[PDB]
Design a protein around this ligand. Structure first.
Ligand code: COA
Ligand code: COA
Ligand code: NAR
Ligand code: NAR
Lengths: 389, 389
């Protein structure tokens, strides 16, 4: 017969739901204690004379519910790059020189761990999604990671630059379509974030910049996503349904500009209220079609943008305190790692489910939700199904 | 009745091949004559003393096979922004201030034209892909376009930043999977490119930067992509098959770095040779499964990185001179508009096929190829099917 586009389409598409088959995570080695961060930060920025501001920063750090963060930046690198320690000094070239190298390097560590868990040859990776908010370059971090891992030159790449904190949801929403539309496709997904682009000295004029310095940390996370798993692959979660929305009345709530001074951060106090005001509508869109209206009966992964977002969502919906445990655990041990955070939380939930002998990767529950929150104000929703242990 | 993930997946997916249903294009109003550009360029950058370098640049402009380009930048803006006219003065903030506004605005013009051709309500747009190599911001150009067009707030966005010249292929590879995997999905795709980020003054120390000043122009293009066309929709092309690859021995052939001086361009003389040496392998991977080995029997869309790429591909494959007509037409009337170019060429091919009464939107042929070329060195391949006129 003559080959038709309709015959090609039927032969090239996959049959089953996109399935998470591996999760790996990595951090820079420099662990920074939150209890002493105000002293460390005001010292390495030569800002000890700003005593009232330091008291404000101490309250921010004490309320952050962060115990520690990992940071590529250390005292030696800051002494070598004093423009990065200024509040607002031309410093983008110094910051780019760091993150164009370190972002794909950290992503390589996470990716190697995901590949090791998957247990399949890396020659079988057909698609790569690389996501960061930390620097840009051409060719991108996707190309650098392809070279570092030795993936096939014909890997289909999606380079997601300057995305922000909702993009852990965005990469899963993308991976889902890549895996489900392509028979055989195995998608490597990497989110890698390094705060060397946003770190800056303190000022009393832009207190929202200081909130960033209290919350943001470094990390990379990788997942393998595919449809129609082989018997030798080990499913962890299914990706069921996705949505992205812009919240009403949220213009300018979270803004970030890449300038000569690096990545600047603008943050309205309305963000927790905006998210908690709109979250039931997002849950109804996702769960009404599944016949689910009890949000204490699903497992939760929420981007921990800060503890006020988690507290206000929990209070608005009446989530029991157990629901945010995995989310709060990652906020505690790592801080806000922008796009990577919800992937660390998915890993933490699988890990705690195994440790406590629960019946599924979703804390013994069947259905789950993953939320990303970021610039827009954008909300990403991913509906998840757990796998039985 | 308990809904299963397998039942959701079956109801959620589209049936047929991703179909281009509209193409719209837009350029800035300032038309720049290539025959006078060396005198304009050397004057406005205060470089008239560099008489030997100006003769070199005249030779580049004369060989470029470009007649004119459209540029957001004009004499008035350049006099207001002397930092942009230096080879390497700090200028990123002035260039960002231009392109963070102008890229989505030019995108809107193109998108409005695509939506008009499509003839459906913009409320039916489910997915938006925005692609640019010109600036970055949070929220991104995708958010700004959603606001400018009044798209639904729940439009699923894919913000493709700092991609480079191959990404007109990339956005079609992405749109194909979004349209095919999602019943009812209608994907708006916008590529918008503004050279305000790369424009800079001449120096004999970086002759590859001067090549960029001869070739790169501004423009935006938009397509609507969907599966399962309604009877009131009008298909133009089907997207059949896609590939991305990195060419062997091509490391550093095309690089671009975002610095305090704007986007810097590095370009090896190796590029045309690398592309022509590797293009047949790309064609065999695409067309041998379709039983096609005569590359004069398919319609051609090639990213016109420069005339030397097109000349060396044509000579390597023994293409008839007519095959590259639509591609050279766009190069002649618009220059190299990075990711947008191949979409202008698809429009030009449809327009010439109508003007000349050919049987199909692909110059009367059934099968076609679209190539993107850019940093990596990356080659994007898209196999197309035309539609009858
Ligand atoms: C920062 C945070 C941990 C502080 O904890 P808290 O429970 O609010 O404690 P407080 O209300 O005492 O706030 C601490 C201080 O930070 C200030 N602050 C909080 N959010 C701020 C913002 N967006 N801009 C400026 N200052 C802010 C408060 O005004 C307060 O100052 P004060 O003690 O001098 O009056 C908490 O407000 C939070 O998690 N906010 C959400 C952060 C967010 O939007 N995340 C998304 C990042 S993309
Ligand atoms: C630029 C171009 C139009 C010049 O036309 P050409 O006649 O084939 O080349 P010529 O040998 O006459 O080149 C003219 C001048 O440009 C110079 N030149 C061409 N490509 C160059 C490069 N990549 N870097 C530096 N100089 C270059 C030549 O050395 C020559 O200088 P000269 O006249 O002082 O000797 C052509 O080389 C071209 O299309 N090149 C491909 C551009 C490319 O790689 N595109 C990708 C963009 S991302
Ligand atoms: O400025 C930043 C920093 C960035 C980031 C966080 C952690 C990290 O490791 C690297 C980068 O996250 C952000 C997220 C935003 O929505 C807006 C922003 O302005 C920023
Ligand atoms: O430096 C640039 C400019 C950019 C561009 C072209 C046209 C336009 O209108 C806007 C930006 O295209 C590029 C494409 C590349 O592969 C590498 C590059 O370095 C560049």
């Amino acid at each position: 017969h003559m080959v038709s586009v309709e015959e090609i389409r039927k032969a090239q598409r996959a049959e089953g739901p996109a399935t998470v088959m591996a999760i790996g995570t990595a951090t820079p080695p420099n662990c920074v204690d939150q209890s002493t961060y105000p002293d460390y930060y005001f010292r390495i920025t030569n800002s000890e004379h700003m005593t009232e501001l330091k008291e404000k920063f101490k309250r921010m750090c004490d309320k952050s519910m962060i115990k520690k963060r990992y940071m590529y930046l250390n005292e030696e690198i800051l002494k070598e790059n004093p423009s990065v320690c200024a509040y607002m000094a031309p410093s983008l070239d110094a910051r780019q020189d760091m993150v164009v190298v370190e972002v794909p390097k950290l992503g390589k560590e996470a990716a190697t761990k995901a590949i090791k868990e998957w247990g399949q040859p890396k020659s079988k990776i057909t698609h790569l999604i690389f996501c960061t908010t930390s620097g840009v370059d051409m060719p991108g971090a996707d190309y650098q990671l392809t070279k570092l891992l030795g993936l096939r030159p014909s890997v289909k790449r999606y380079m997601m630059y300057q995305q922000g904190c909702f993009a852990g949801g965005t990469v899963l929403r993308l991976a889902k379509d890549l895996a489900e539309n392509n028979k055989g496709a195995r998608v490597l997904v990497v989110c890698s974030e390094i705060t060397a682009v946003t770190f800056r000295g303190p000022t009393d004029t832009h207190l929202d910049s200081l909130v960033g310095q209290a919350l943001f940390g470094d990390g990379a996370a990788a997942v393998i996503v595919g449809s129609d798993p082989l018997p030798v692959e080990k499913p962890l979660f299914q990706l069921v349904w996705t949505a992205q929305t812009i919240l009403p009345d949220s213009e300018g709530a979270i803004d970030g500009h890449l300038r000569e001074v690096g990545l600047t951060f603008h943050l309205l106090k309305d963000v927790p209220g905006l998210i908690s005001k709109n979250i039931e509508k997002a849950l109804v869109e996702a769960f009404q079609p599944l016949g689910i209206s009890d949000y204490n009966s699903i497992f939760w992964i929420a981007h921990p943008g800060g503890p006020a977002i988690l507290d206000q969502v929990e209070a608005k919906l009446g989530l029991k305190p157990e629901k945010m445990e995995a989310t709060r655990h990652v906020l505690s041990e790592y801080g806000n790692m922008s796009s990577a955070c919800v992937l660390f939380i998915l890993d933490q939930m699988r890990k705690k489910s195994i440790e406590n002998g629960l019946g599924t990767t979703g804390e013994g529950l069947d259905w789950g939700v993953l939320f990303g929150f970021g610039p827009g104000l954008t909300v990403e929703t991913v509906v998840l199904r757990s796998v039985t242990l």
